[PDB]
Design a protein around this ligand. Structure first.
Ligand SMILES: [Zn+2]
Ligand SMILES: [Zn+2]
Ligand SMILES: [Zn+2]
Ligand SMILES: [Zn+2]
Lengths: 51, 64, 1079, 56, 112, 51, 46
């Protein structure tokens, strides 16, 4: 097995093989106060929905 | 068929964790925990190794 | 326990393996059978003896005779067959018989692990197939209504016949004649009722009465002795009255055997020893017995004709057999050997006073197996096509299925009968056309082989069995009659003990576990079947051996004990083989446990003689991989059962050394996150059929609409669902007895010109390409010529391209140059390729987004796939949703997820375990719209689910043409995208346009965009005669002698031919440019 | 088979996928295909200019 | 096979402008700006910072079609006030915000 | 040279994802923009591999 | 130095042409692969 690699710049747009991110957490207002969501539930939202 | 550099789902590397894993098995007899310690939190990167089927082994028993 | 019966199952496959049947039935032909066949109707007006069957050989020019091997014959496209020799008496080579891989005569049969690895044969390959001219050929099971059994059919109000009973007869061992006995019954259930039967060679039908006198019984009451076993059954007797009067005209054996048109009477006998009920035996001194039979038949008849017993269930699988490989090689052989018989007769009819070209037995066999036409060759296509196909190799579970497949020659057969339970898988069966006519065998099912009758015939006539010969229906009231393979071998008094002794004799193993014994108390009879072709399953024995209460014979000691094969598990009376017939009179318990308060969540659950090893064993390969098939709409399971046979993965490991046309390997495989305990035996973990995609069932861009799914580009780049694609073009250097050979070079010029379009510059001087070469457009892959220098070089199909992966040259038996080329290509998933889960949820890509654009969860985690919620409500497939949940747990918990059928796992249970880990008890998670970052007003069912990448990728379908290669006969375009063809504009497409009134446009299709042609008609005799020499103007049209009145028209060349045809049929289509008939 | 309905030229077939941003009467066509099917349009002093670009 | 070359989502080809501005006749003082080689990343960001500047009477954007990474932005402001400036400022304000952020991220950092 | 059971472009893919250093990544230009025909040290990084 | 075909068993670089037989420098086994190119091949990681 004989190779020879050549590296170049580039970004994640051009190809996934670039981006240094790899998963990124994002959350806001964990306690739905702004009500930008309507929680699903069977009886009690607070208890059925993981804090 | 060998391990996949970077996990499809999120992107996190997973090339190194192979030898580490197959050891923490043979001796330390873990799964869940091993992984947890290997720094593999969320199921997304997780499923890659635990679902990997190393075919290459049988292939290597072939001549050319 | 439940987890125990699994070990029992484990014990089974360790010894028998998925393909028992195939090998077993092959060996039975080699080992034994083949001999018995040659020694029966042999001797010719000089006998034959034992036959020798040597091993594989390869007689090729430029070498002696190289001992050939499988993995070679494949690559060189040969034939895994060996020689056959026979010491004929008044040494000789006689035909090549194709061995079956992994059997007994295949050397592999002994070699061990390392030993095999050295033979290049992939261990995981269970073999069981033949290797004709390269491609692996798999013989497909052929179902057929069993023979030698009593039936009864009612025949519709409009018919001179009321009811009828039939019985197909054939010698279980010896020739096997296919002449059936028909005992009709004219006069419907009303009209003023004769009884006639059909005999071979008899013009009309004969009335039962004469048949009795013709046997040797002329007086009454000695006749009803045989028919009725109860002088007090006036009803039955009445019917018969009008019939006796019919034959009242023949009062003896002379005329009896006469009327069938001294010479005929002598001939009459013949027709009784060779035509009349030919099975049973054709000896001599047994006349008596058959008389009792012919009585038992007319009885069984009326028993229905008097509304006491329903009409026989035509599709009662138990009365159906399955001619596996071994059996087939018989009825085929005879037809041949009989032509061989009379062939050696021809050589002797030339000798006006060695020769035997043992290739007719070689090439004959080949023809069939190659195409699928059994019955000889010649101008005899009057055989059956379907038998023997081109073994699938799309995926492992595909190939598997194919070998375990059964067919069934042609609204009632297609039905899924009850009898199919246990023996055949309910879901796996081809869509459309023949659907239900192609069945696959279950896991536990097996076919018989052929045990012996006598060791039980004796065992009977030596335990209470008073021979049939001397019977007295009134003296012997409840005499329990016993049948043997459809023959009546006398009756027996109290059977209860006689019964539970033979069956116990079998359990120790001194009378093969394969024989069937059915007692029909409700009629007082005993059915005995030894037959070859009977499907059977295994069951647990219960037996009340508890003198301290009321319990399963098997114990936890048999279990942990698992010189102890599966044969011992049977040799200890712990399991029995119950066929479909015997089933009728037994009572089977489902769950072993229970069948010997509750949670308001789990599923509601509703003397015992046998138990079910495990219900999840009634499935075959297809359904066997589907998780929770008991949670989806059944008809859906049936779909995945087919689509499975069309996904990508890895079909074998030797694949890197196979020169087969078409083959796909999934870049990175992945064993499922959820599995069946049965998978453990399907080596699936070592040969997965797909990958675990991070599904997310939600609406988004609206590109996941109508069963189309969105796939995360980002991970498509990370190699998700990529697959290699192979292909293998092959060529030879043909010759002629007249020394004129072809060549394998890099041709140019040389007086001919006959060459291709593409480039040859990428061809080294050996007339081949290199494995580095980047081929495309049409580029010639191989270089060949035919001197008669015309090129015959093969060019890469215009639509394809990729890279060469391995070229190889080789000799042929005819010392010719054999050369195969293999091209590889990586196939990336594209905005069109088809995919699907294991729940009939098939779909293609509509678009592809990246990480950003994609929706995501606070944790970070992002989906790889987004399918639409609309593909759930009417599809009803719920297990999918469940497979998702379970798999979302095993992911987070690291523990392998069991999905196996009817266990003690519920959605409420799983939900709690997922709540123990941290995430929502139902899976659902919050997500932020990748474009704005703002949360989604709703929540989504985000969870890892297995996904197979079925083949059928766009670039293999995409086709567009505008005036291309035209057909020859028609001159219209050609078929198929491969030949650059054109789409048909069939009737239905015509119609529509006509409704639209698109007159002209249609006229422009059929002409300008296809056929078209300018023909010259004659103004007098409206024909296409005119000799139009477009130069000297000369037109003419002799016979009607004109040169002045001629017209020109524009019609489709296709039509012009239609007319020439019509002309050539003597009909005269006159074409007039002016109306003449007036009105 | 060949007369009441025949295979014709200037025709194409592939795999479909819906697009929620295409007018009702539109139909997104794959580049490849557009580069294959033609249309005999006579030369006229009104579209010559446009044609002269297309030809080069 | 038929998919463009990836690098066509950001590099402008032979004579083609990033920005194209067209006047709106429908109503007075309004424009529709065609943005070439861009997406939500930069779009949504401009849209946002405009509803902060209470001098903007309108500001919306859209993606003609997902295959092409482009987008049109229509903006309308009060009398005699050019949108471009408010775009400059709020864009500069982004940089300032970011200049601050950078700085505020450096001092914060240093304390480790 | 490559006698591996994996194909050429199969390996090519693999190496594409492997993370390389990118500290002074900002001071380099794409070989395509570099006025050098194809590539060079002033615009590309070559590596070797024999096994 | 230099190579044309190799053998499936006695991997020995051969080299031949018409009528010069189609075997190997030992092993009768008439297989033989057509060895790599000299001009290096460039691949894409897609
Ligand atoms: Zn991940
Ligand atoms: Zn004429
Ligand atoms: Zn450069
Ligand atoms: Zn050799």
């Amino acid at each position: 097995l004989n190779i020879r690699c050549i590296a170049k710049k580039g970004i994640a747009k051009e190809h996934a093989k670039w981006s240094p991110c790899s998963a990124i957490a994002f959350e806001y207002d964990p306690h739905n106060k702004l009500k930008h969501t309507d929680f699903w539930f069977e009886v009690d939202a607070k208890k059925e929905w993981p804090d | 068929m060998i391990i996949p550099v970077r996990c499809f789902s999120c992107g996190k590397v997973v090339g190194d964790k192979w030898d580490a894993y197959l050891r923490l098995l043979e001796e330390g007899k873990q799964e869940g925990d091993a992984l947890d310690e290997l720094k593999l939190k969320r199921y997304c990167c997780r499923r890659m190794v635990l679902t990997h089927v190393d075919l290459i082994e049988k292939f290597l028993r072939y001549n050319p | 326990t439940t987890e125990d019966c699994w070990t029992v199952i484990s014990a089974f496959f360790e010894e028998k393996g998925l393909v028992s049947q195939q090998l077993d039935s092959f060996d039975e032909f080699m080992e034994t059978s083949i001999q018995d066949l040659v020694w029966e109707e042999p001797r010719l007006i000089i006998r034959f003896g034992k036959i020798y069957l040597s091993r594989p050989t390869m007689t090729e020019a430029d070498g002696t005779t190289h001992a050939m091997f499988p993995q070679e014959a494949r690559l060189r496209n040969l034939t895994y067959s060996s020689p056959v020799y026979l010491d004929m008496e008044k040494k000789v080579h006689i035909g090549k018989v194709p061995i079956m891989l992994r059997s007994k005569f295949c050397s592999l049969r002994t070699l061990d692990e390392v030993d095999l690895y050295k033979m290049k044969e992939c261990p995981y390959d269970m073999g069981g197939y033949f290797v004709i001219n390269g491609s692996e050929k798999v013989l497909i099971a052929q179902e057929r209504s069993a023979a030698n059994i009593v039936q009864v059919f009612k025949k519709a109000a409009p018919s001179p016949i009321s009811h009828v009973a039939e019985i197909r007869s054939a010698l279980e061992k010896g020739s096997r004649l296919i002449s059936t006995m028909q005992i009709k019954l004219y006069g419907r259930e009303d009209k003023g009722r004769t009884i006639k039967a059909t005999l071979p060679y008899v013009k009309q039908d004969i009335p039962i009465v004469i048949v009795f006198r013709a046997l040797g019984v002329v007086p009454d009451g000695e006749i009803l002795q045989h028919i009725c076993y109860d002088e007090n059954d006036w009803q039955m007797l009445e019917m018969l009255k009008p019939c006796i009067e019919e034959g009242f005209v023949i009062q003896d054996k002379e005329v009896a055997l006469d009327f069938i048109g001294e010479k005929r009477i002598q001939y009459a006998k013949d027709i009784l020893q060779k035509e009349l009920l030919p099975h049973i035996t054709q000896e001599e001194g047994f006349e008596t017995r058959k008389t009792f039979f012919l009585g038992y038949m007319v009885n069984r008849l009326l028993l229905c004709a008097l509304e006491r017993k329903d009409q026989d269930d035509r599709d009662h699988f138990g009365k159906k057999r399955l001619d596996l490989a071994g059996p087939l090689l018989a009825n085929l052989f005879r037809i041949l050997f009989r032509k061989l018989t009379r062939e050696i007769y021809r050589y002797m009819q030339r000798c006006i006073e060695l020769a035997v070209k043992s290739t007719t037995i070689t090439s004959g066999l080949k023809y069939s197996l190659a195409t699928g036409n059994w019955g000889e060759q010649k101008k005899a296509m009057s055989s059956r096509a379907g038998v023997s196909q081109v073994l699938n190799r799309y995926t492992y579970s595909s190939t598997l299925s194919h070998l375990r497949r059964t067919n069934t020659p042609i609204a009632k057969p297609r039905q899924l009968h009850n009898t199919h339970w246990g023996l055949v898988c309910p879901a796996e069966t081809p869509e459309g056309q023949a659907c239900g006519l192609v069945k696959n065998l279950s896991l536990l099912s097996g076919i018989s082989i052929g045990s012996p009758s006598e060791p039980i015939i004796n065992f009977l006539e030596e335990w209470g069995m008073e021979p049939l010969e001397d019977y007295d229906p009134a003296q012997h009231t409840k005499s329990t009659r016993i049948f043997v393979n459809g023959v009546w071998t006398g009756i027996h008094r109290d059977p209860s003990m006689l019964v539970s002794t033979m069956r116990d004799l079998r359990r120790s193993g001194a009378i093969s576990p394969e024989v069937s014994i059915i007692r029909d108390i409700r009629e007082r009879e005993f059915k005995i079947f030894t037959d070859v072709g009977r499907v059977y399953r295994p069951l647990f024995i219960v037996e009340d051996d508890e003198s301290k209460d009321n319990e399963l014979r098997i114990t936890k000691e048999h279990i942990r004990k698992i010189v102890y094969g599966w044969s011992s598990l049977v040799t200890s009376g712990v399991i029995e083989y119950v066929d479909g017939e015997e089933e009728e009179t037994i009572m089977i318990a489902m769950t072993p446990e229970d069948l010997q308060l509750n949670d308001t969540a789990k599923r509601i659950k509703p003397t015992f003689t046998h138990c079910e090893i495990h219900p999840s064993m009634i499935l075959g390969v297809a359904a066997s991989i589907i998780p929770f098939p008991d949670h989806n709409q059944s008809p859906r399971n049936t779909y995945q059962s087919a689509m499975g046979k069309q996904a990508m993965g890895v079909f074998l490991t030797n694949y890197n050394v196979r020169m087969d046309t078409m083959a796909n390997i999934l870049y990175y495989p992945q064993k499922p996150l959820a599995k069946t305990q049965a998978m453990e035996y399907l080596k699936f973990r070592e040969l997965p059929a797909g990958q675990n995609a991070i599904v997310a069932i939600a609406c988004y861009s609206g590109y996941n609409q109508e069963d189309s799914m969105i796939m995360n580009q980002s991970s498509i780049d990370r190699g998700l669902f990529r697959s290699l694609f192979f292909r293998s073009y092959m060529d030879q250097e043909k010759r002629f007895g007249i020394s004129i050979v072809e060549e394998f070079e890099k041709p140019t010029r040389a007086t001919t010109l006959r060459l291709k379009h593409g480039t040859y510059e990428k061809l080294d001087e050996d007339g081949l390409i290199a494995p580095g070469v980047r081929v495309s457009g049409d580029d010639i892959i191989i270089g060949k010529t035919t001197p008669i220098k015309r090129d015959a070089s093969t060019p890469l199909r215009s639509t394809e391209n990729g890279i060469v992966d391995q070229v190889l040259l080789t000799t042929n038996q005819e010392g010719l140059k054999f050369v195969k080329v293999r091209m590889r290509t990586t196939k990336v998933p594209q905005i069109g390729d088809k995919f699907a889960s294991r729940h009939g949820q098939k779909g293609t890509i509509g678009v592809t987004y990246r990480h950003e654009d994609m929706p995501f969860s606070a944790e970070g985690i992002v989906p790889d796939l987004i399918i639409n919620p609309h593909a759930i409500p009417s599809r009803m497939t719920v297990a999918h949703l469940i497979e998702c949940l379970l798999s979302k747990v095993g992911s987070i918990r690291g523990y392998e997820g069991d999905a196996t059928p009817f266990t003690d796992l519920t959605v409420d249970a799983v939900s709690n375990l997922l709540r123990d880990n941290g995430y929502q008890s139902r899976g659902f998670e919050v997500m932020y719209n990748g474009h704005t970052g703002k949360k989604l007003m709703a929540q989504v069912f985000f969870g890892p689910t297995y996904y197979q990448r079925l083949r059928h990728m766009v670039d293999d379908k995409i086709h567009a043409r505008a005036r291309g290669p035209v057909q020859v006969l028609t001159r219209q375009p050609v078929e198929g995208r491969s030949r650059d063809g054109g789409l048909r504009f069939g009737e239905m497409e015509r119609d529509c346009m006509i409704a639209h009134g698109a007159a002209g446009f249609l006229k422009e299709r059929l002409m300008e965009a296809s056929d078209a042609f300018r023909v010259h008609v004659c103004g007098i005799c409206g024909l296409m005669s005119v000799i139009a020499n477009l130069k000297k103007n000369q037109f003419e049209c002799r016979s009607c002698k004109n040169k002045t009145n001629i017209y020109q028209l524009h019609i489709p060349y296709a039509a012009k031919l239609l007319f020439q045809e019509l002309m050539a049929m003597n009909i005269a289509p006159r074409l007039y440019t002016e109306r003449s008939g007036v009105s | 088979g060949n007369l009441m309905g025949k295979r014709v030229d200037f025709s194409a077939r592939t795999v479909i996928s819906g697009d929620p941003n295409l007018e009702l009467d539109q139909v997104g066509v794959p580049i490849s295909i557009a580069k294959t099917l033609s249309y005999p349009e006579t030369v006229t002093q009104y579209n010559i200019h446009r044609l002269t670009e297309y030809v080069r | 096979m038929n998919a463009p070359d990836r690098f066509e989502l950001f590099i402008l080809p032979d004579d083609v402008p990033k920005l194209k501005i067209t006047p709106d006749s429908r109503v007075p003082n309004c424009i529709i700006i065609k943005f070439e080689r861009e997406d939500h990343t930069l779009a949504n960001l401009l849209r946002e910072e405009l509803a902060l500047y209470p001098d903007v009477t309108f500001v919306a954007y859209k993606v003609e079609h997902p295959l092409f990474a482009n987008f049109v932005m229509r903006l309308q402001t009060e009398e005699g006030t050019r949108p471009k400036q408010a775009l400059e400022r709020a864009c500069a304000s982004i940089i300032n915000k970011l200049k601050t952020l950078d700085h505020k991220f450096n001092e914060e950092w240093n304390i480790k | 040279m490559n006698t591996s059971v994996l194909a050429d472009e199969f390996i090519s893919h693999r190496l594409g994802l492997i993370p390389l250093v990118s500290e002074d990544v900002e001071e380099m230009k794409y070989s395509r923009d570099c006025t050098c025909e194809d590539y060079c040290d002033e615009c590309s990084v070559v590596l070797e591999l024999s096994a | 130095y230099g190579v044309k075909y190799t053998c499936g068993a006695c991997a020995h670089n051969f080299s031949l042409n018409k009528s010069d037989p189609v075997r190997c420098k030992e092993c009768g086994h008439r297989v033989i692969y057509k060895a790599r190119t000299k001009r290096m091949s460039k691949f894409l990681t897609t």
